[PDB]
Design a protein that fits this description.
- With 226 residues, the protein is α/β, with parallel strands linked by helices.
- It has one domain: Phosphatidylinositol (PI) phosphodiesterase (TIM Barrel, Alpha-Beta Barrel).
- The chain has ten helices and eleven strands.
- It has helices spanning 22-30, 57-60, 71-77, 85-91, 108-115, 128-134, 152-162, 177-188, 201-207, 219-224; strands spanning 6-10, 35-42, 48-50, 55-56, 62-65, 97-102, 121-125, 140-143, 166-170, 192-196, 213-216.
- The protein has an eight-stranded parallel beta barrel with strand order 1-2-6-7-8-9-10-11, surrounded by four helices. Strands 4-5 form a two-stranded antiparallel ribbon.
- β10, α9 (201-207) and β11 (213-216) form a beta-alpha-beta unit.
- The structure holds sodium ion.
- Sodium ion binds at residues 115-116, 118-119, 121.
- InterPro entries: GP_PDE_dom, PLC-like_Pdiesterase_TIM-brl.
- This is GP-PDE domain-containing protein.
- One of its GO terms (biological process) is lipid metabolic process.
- Residues 6-226 form the GP-PDE domain.
Length: 226
């Protein structure tokens, strides 16, 4: 028996449905997720589109950049599968969490404007300065990679100074005892710890006492591990 962990579907229920589509997001919620994580970028016409990659090559085989096409053009090319942040909000209840990963600084102002009306959002990015500069007064979470945090000491200083709502850490961070200690110190201050992108239930069991949330492709699995 364990304490409760927020389960977010990584690009929706992406193990079973096409990542970052309305279907994937709706299916994550149907499967009992507390919410979803998704990725945002700008189209040519300056609209907020949901796409992890900057182009359509990996998922559609099309050498077309998101920023080079209008929303209408993108929908035509993907036969309607690509969606906008606006459309996600229309299809996911505001009792559910949406973790919006900002992939492009230039999308930030448009994302903030559309988000004004909507609660239960967490903005995240590997661009920590962007969050600190433009996302004050919202819930934001630092995404941590091998380089961006600088030194552990500098990262601790930053988190103390800026008070992010959450820290979104790779699950591999829990392999080092000092990292575990640092994260415990953050949590004791009320910072919410999410791990990503975790699909392995054994690793989850080992670390779940240390975390507040999990970002996973395997939504039903992790919901049933509650
Ligand atoms: Na809002």
């Amino acid at each position: 028996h364990h304490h409760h962990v927020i389960v977010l579907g990584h690009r929706g229920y992406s193990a079973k449905y096409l990542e970052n589509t309305l279907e994937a997001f709706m299916k994550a919620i149907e499967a009992g997720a507390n919410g979803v994580e998704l990725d945002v970028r700008l189209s040519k016409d300056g609209k907020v589109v949901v796409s992890h990659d900057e182009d359509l090559k990996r998922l559609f085989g099309l050498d077309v950049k998101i920023r080079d096409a209008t929303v209408s053009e993108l929908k035509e090319l993907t036969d309607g599968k690509i969606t906008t942040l606006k459309e996600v909000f229309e299809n996911v209840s505001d009792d559910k969490i949406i973790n919006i990963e900002i992939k492009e600084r230039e999308a930030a102002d448009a994302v903030l404007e559309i988000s004004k009306k909507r609660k239960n959002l967490i903005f995240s990015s590997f661009d920590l300065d962007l969050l600190d500069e433009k996302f004050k007064g919202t819930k934001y979470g630092y995404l941590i990679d091998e380089e961006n945090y600088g030194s552990i000491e500098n990262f601790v200083e930053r988190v103390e100074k800026e008070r992010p709502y959450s820290l979104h850490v790779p699950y591999q961070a829990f392999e080092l005892e000092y990292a575990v200690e640092v994260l415990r110190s953050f949590r004791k201050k009320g910072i919410v710890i999410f791990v990503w992108t975790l699909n392995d239930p054994e690793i989850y069991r080992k670390i779940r006492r240390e975390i507040d949330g999990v970002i996973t492709d395997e939504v039903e699995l992790f919901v049933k591990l509650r």
